[PDB]
Each structure stands twice: as structure tokens, then as C-alpha cells.
Amino acid sequence: PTVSDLECKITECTYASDFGGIATVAYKSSKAGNCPIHSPSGVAVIKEN
């Protein structure tokens, strides 16, 4: 699925080591299925691939 026309926002970001940072994402898909994710910036490390 193409996911654009979305929105992302943190909801409780934890300024920390353990994966405490969270963020809802208003996904706006075309199909329905899986969608691999990553932050190309090294600022954020994500638990979910």
C-alpha cells in the first residue's frame, strides 16, 4: 500500500534508551497490508521493523 497523505506525531516520547518513545501515525493507505518502516536519520531507533 501507498501510505502518503498521512500524519505522524509523538504521544509520549521518552528521552531515553529503552524504546520508550512512541508515536501514533495517521496511516493513509491505498491497499491494506504490511509496510516496512525505518528512520533514515539515526536520531530515532525503532523497535518495529
Place this chain on the structure above:
Amino acid sequence: RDKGAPLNDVAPFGCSIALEPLRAENCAVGSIPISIDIPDAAFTRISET
């Protein structure tokens, strides 16, 4: 019969009395710096509310 009145009838700042451990119950005055360590198990993680 020529006494004075009782401290549970003349005290200030709101107290009651007992001939018991000599407490002065329920004295409403000032503030108390209270601090608690909650059980972390009782917390709900942020991504569930």
C-alpha cells in the same frame, strides 16, 4: 463545677480529643509534603490508554 472549658471545645485549628493514647484528632492546619513510590506494575503503559 468552677472549672474551665475543654480543649475539645476551646482548641484552635480544628482538633478533637480522646482519653486514649492522648491524641488530638483531625487537626486541620497547614500542609504536609507527601511523596509516594507507586508500584510500577500498577502503571498502564502510555500506548494503551
